[PDB]
Design a protein around this ligand. Structure first.
Ligand SMILES: Nc1ncnc2c1ncn2[C@@H]1O[C@H](COP(=O)(O)OP(=O)(O)O)[C@@H](O)[C@H]1O
Ligand SMILES: Nc1ncnc2c1ncn2[C@@H]1O[C@H](COP(=O)(O)OP(=O)(O)O)[C@@H](O)[C@H]1O
Ligand SMILES: Nc1ncnc2c1ncn2[C@@H]1O[C@H](COP(=O)(O)OP(=O)(O)O)[C@@H](O)[C@H]1O
Lengths: 740, 250
């Protein structure tokens, strides 16, 4: 029409499956209202009817659409749609809908009562012929296709209106891709890497003729990696389904099982098949089984197949938009001849999910499981440190099986056969999830976690000037690069916190990594010691590699003096301050990128024995001294520690801070934990005494951590730093800053 | 019948091979006594007669049954049974029992004197046609099948009553799985891991059509481990025999 009425579709965030959300501006500008129903016309003369909402985050030219209605319009993600207002509510009278035979099989039960009854209960849902909708429940997600509508050809159901569900399920059509297939809505904890992959494979697949009409290099090889069962194959099929490109799947062991010469025929013919059906995506699952390192190859038969794969990768990049996505456990476990340009040039690190990602994964897998009311997936997601998507999927399935196993199978074992009724009535309690997570699932990974820590600036008491310096050093080089370029100054890439142990160095690291929303990699003392004893300092490289793969980052080496004091302290070993590991730290820190937004932070509670060749410019050179707290800071420490625990109101923390002088920040936490221990003991003892009531069951006494509990927890207070150590830090500061 | 008279079977703990033990509540509630004999009807129109006891540990809906009588009812572990009271002691007069040729081979000796003499000595054992019982001794465990009972079709042997053991051993039937096969009763020192394995393979094997009718992930691969000769293959065959699922061995 060449005038503005057309919009760009994109992903959705709302849990409603029959609405579209648009930005408050485009709402007033398109001459529409909040809630007003409209027509959405897309490709191939297939339109639909929908409801509109308001969402500040989504931009003007963008329209939230969930996968069901987005697929209904025959359009796919990233395309353009026409929205026309229609306030013509032709309120329905009776609907003729039937399920699909593919999705409905084995499902013994009156589908009307079990699914559609709360679905259309007080639901003003608009329906039009050619719409295949879906409803979830009873460990199932059922598809319904409407054939015959009383108001022709579209209507809106009123709460009064009947719904008429006679007939047999119909066989599926050739031009709707079924919704058991995977889409971007399913992938929970990888919404950031999905951005990279979508921006990489958007133009070659959606707009193929464009790259024919332009001389420019397209991305050909993409290497997904990360630990197994993280969602790589999932991401591949999701991208394939959303962009609509043909998807060929090559399995590593499958090809490697065939006879010598049969496997290479399979590879060649697979590449031929994908070339014939362009646009395409080849997924070579378990690449480290086909093409490992040269040291682990022995025997012609292996190397020959590696060579065949290399030749096919090099050949495909003549006038053939076939992207090849390959998955592997670890990137340095496959043949390095593959990661050279033209074959596998793009590398993506999926990585294990974090707290918010795990909660999202849980919501994805509990989508149609009819959870109980007490189920608080926040607690679960907080207790699943170490789980990947497969672990959480198995956890949800195991909790479901436990709920089927306790009752509702043996209880109705003797009276009546299987039915959908029991499936609806199954509410999986929070205890059930606690059991499934309790013992029956071994978390399958113990790698270095990379995430944005949940610590915030108010979690730390005192240290305000240290906060402004940290904000300056980490923020200013990224948010105002033009000032640094104008004044010629170079931005430093390191800090060295130093001071008494247990005063907030790790807290400050996590806090400044959170405020900038940058990843955080903690490398504790035992790890450096493990690399020193094991004499494998060549792992330090790998560490920095992670910091490059997850940029922007904050690489944090705490207890940096660990090696220095492992071989004796001040006198100690006869040698100098040069170690096997710290030397690799120097080497890798001198040899990183000019500005890759990676900010190394060190920490040491013994700054006198640290290798002085690390305090030189171009390395960790900003010495910040984390001092012992004061009263106006100790109050804040006590408040920030106690704000999670229910404490009484007559307790004075200022008196504590007055009495606890020179207490390091950890002692002020041991006090609170010990007082909490006393309170918990009193609670349990009172519970048992009230259980000795056998004369008559009543509400537990008031659980405010009270005063005169601290009067006992304070009895066993210890100072974890002598005055001598304070004197040592004072001397360090005095000498190194003031001497001459 | 849809009213409470049906029970769930499970494992047994008593060394007697011809009794069933039930919880003190279900005893008073089912209108029964301690020691009173009853009929246990199971699947495929095959019932039996048994004696009842009292056991605090076993729960209400659960009934201790040892492998011999549990196999006698044609039912398998985890299924449902119907118990009916029958104080009708039709005290026997003569029994016609013969062994099986499979279990009795090479066993030179008058089987009557060596096995059944202390077995039925002052033994008020109830017998019904179609019951294959067993008695142990002499480094052997011998199976006996009753063909012809004087009180038809069931009886109870008195200490006075004779037992008549003429005839040749009979070839085994196609619908009783022999008791030299392995069952959960044999595995001694792994009663805790057996809980895990039973709860894992209970639903996929006992109730196969359920997982057809539900979208949920079943456990597929199980990796038993431990030092050799600890009882792994034993546990496998035991699970296979109790759930009745076909067992292929690679
Ligand atoms: N990021 C994820 N989002 C949603 N589901 C996931 C995710 N990761 C794993 N799962 C669940 O576990 C399964 C394993 O995914 P898969 O692609 O097979 O892992 P990989 O290919 O890395 O071995 C998925 O099919 C899904 O059921
Ligand atoms: N200034 C502070 N504000 C808030 N909490 C503190 C402070 N100092 C120490 N803590 C507490 O001490 C504990 C350990 O401190 P941490 O930062 O690990 O010590 P270090 O700085 O030696 O690494 C933390 O759990 C934190 O709650
Ligand atoms: N837990 C057990 N309970 C009863 N008998 C056992 C047990 N473990 C071993 N045995 C005896 O030793 C034999 C060895 O069992 P088997 O399953 O062959 O061991 P594995 O397979 O571990 O090598 C069994 O047939 C049985 O005779």
């Amino acid at each position: 029409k060449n005038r503005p009425n057309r919009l760009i579709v994109d992903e959705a965030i709302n849990e409603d499956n029959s609405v579209v959300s648009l930005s408050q501006p485009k709402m007033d500008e398109l001459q529409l209202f909040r809630g007003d129903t409209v027509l959405l016309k897309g490709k191939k003369r297939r339109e639909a009817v929908c409801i509109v909402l308001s969402d500040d985050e989504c931009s003007d030219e963008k329209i939230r659409m969930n996968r069901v209605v987005r697929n209904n319009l025959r359009v796919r993600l990233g395309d353009v749609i026409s929205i026309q207002p229609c306030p013509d509510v032709k309120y329905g009278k009776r609907i003729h809908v039937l399920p699909i035979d593919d999705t409905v099989e084995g499902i013994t039960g009156n589908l009307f009562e079990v699914y559609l009854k709360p679905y259309f209960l007080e639901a003003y849902r608009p329906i039009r012929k050619g719409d295949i909708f879906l409803v979830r429940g009873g460990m199932r997600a059922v598809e319904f296709k409407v054939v015959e509508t009383d108001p022709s050809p579209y209507c809106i159901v009123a709460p009064d209106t009947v719904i008429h569900c006679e007939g047999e399920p119909i066989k599926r059509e050739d031009e709707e891709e079924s919704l058991n297939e995977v889409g971007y809505d399913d992938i929970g904890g990888c919404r950031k890497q999905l951005a990279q992959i979508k921006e990489m494979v958007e133009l070659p697949l959606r707009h193929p003729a464009l790259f024919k009409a332009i001389g420019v290099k397209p991305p050909r090889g993409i290497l997904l990696y990360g630990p197994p069962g993280t969602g790589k194959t999932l991401i591949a099929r999701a991208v394939a389904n959303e962009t609509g490109a043909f998807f060929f799947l090559i399995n590593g062991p499958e090809i490697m099982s065939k006879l010598a010469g049969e496997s290479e025929s399979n590879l060649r013919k697979a590449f031929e098949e994908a070339e014939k059906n362009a646009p395409a995506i080849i997924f070579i699952d378990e690449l480290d089984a086909i093409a490992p390192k040269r040291e682990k190859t022995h025997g012609e038969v292996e190397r020959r197949i590696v060579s065949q794969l290399l030749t096919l990768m090099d050949g495909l990049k003549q006038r053939a938009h076939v992207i090849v996505m390959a998955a592997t456990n670890r990137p340095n476990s496959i043949d390095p001849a593959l990661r050279r340009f033209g074959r596998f040039d793009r590398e993506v690190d999926i990585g294990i999910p974090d707290a918010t990602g795990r909660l999202e994964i849980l919501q994805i897998h509990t989508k149609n499981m009819k959870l109980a009311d007490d189920v608080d997936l926040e607690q679960v997601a907080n207790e699943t440190h170490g789980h990947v998507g497969a672990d959480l999927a198995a956890l949800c399935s195991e909790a479901a099986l436990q709920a089927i196993r306790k009752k509702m199978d043996l209880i109705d074992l003797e009276d009546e056969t299987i039915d959908a009724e029991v499936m609806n009535s199954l509410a999986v309690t929070m205890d059930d999830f606690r059991w499934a997570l309790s013992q029956s699932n071994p978390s399958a990974l113990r790698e270095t976690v990379v995430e944005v820590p949940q610590v915030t600036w108010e979690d730390i008491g005192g240290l305000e000037d240290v906060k402004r310096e940290l904000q300056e050093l980490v923020q200013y080089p990224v948010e105002h690069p033009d000032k640094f370029l104008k004044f010629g100054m170079t931005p430093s890439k390191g800090v060295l916190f130093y001071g008494p142990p247990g005063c907030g160095k790790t807290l400050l690291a996590k806090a400044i990594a959170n405020e900038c929303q940058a990843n955080f990699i903690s490398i504790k003392g035992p790890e450096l010691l493990t690399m020193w004893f094991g004499e494998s300092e060549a792992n330090v490289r790998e560490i920095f590699d992670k910091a490059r793969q997850a940029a922007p980052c904050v690489l944090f080496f705490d207890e940096l003096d660990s090696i220095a004091k492992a071989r004796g302290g001040n006198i100690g070993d006869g040698g100098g301050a040069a170690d096997r590991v710290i030397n690799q730290i120097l080497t890798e820190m001198d040899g990183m990128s000019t500005k890759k937004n990676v900010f190394i932070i060190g920490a040491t509670n013994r700054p006198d024995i640290i290798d002085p060749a690390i305090l030189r410019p171009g390395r960790l050179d900003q010495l910040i001294y984390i001092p012992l707290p004061d009263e106006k800071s100790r109050v804040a420490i006590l408040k920030a520690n106690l704000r999670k625990s229910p404490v009484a109101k007559d307790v004075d923390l200022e008196f504590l801070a007055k009495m606890t002088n020179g207490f390091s920040g950890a002692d002020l936490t041991e006090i609170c934990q010990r007082a909490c221990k006393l309170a918990i003991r009193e609670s349990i003892e009172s519970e048992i005494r009230r259980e000795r009531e056998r004369q008559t069951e009543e509400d537990d006494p008031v659980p405010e951590i009270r005063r005169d509990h601290f009067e006992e927890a304070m009895r066993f207070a210890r100072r974890s730093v002598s005055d001598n150590d304070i004197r040592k830090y004072e001397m360090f500061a005095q000498t190194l800053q003031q001497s001459r």
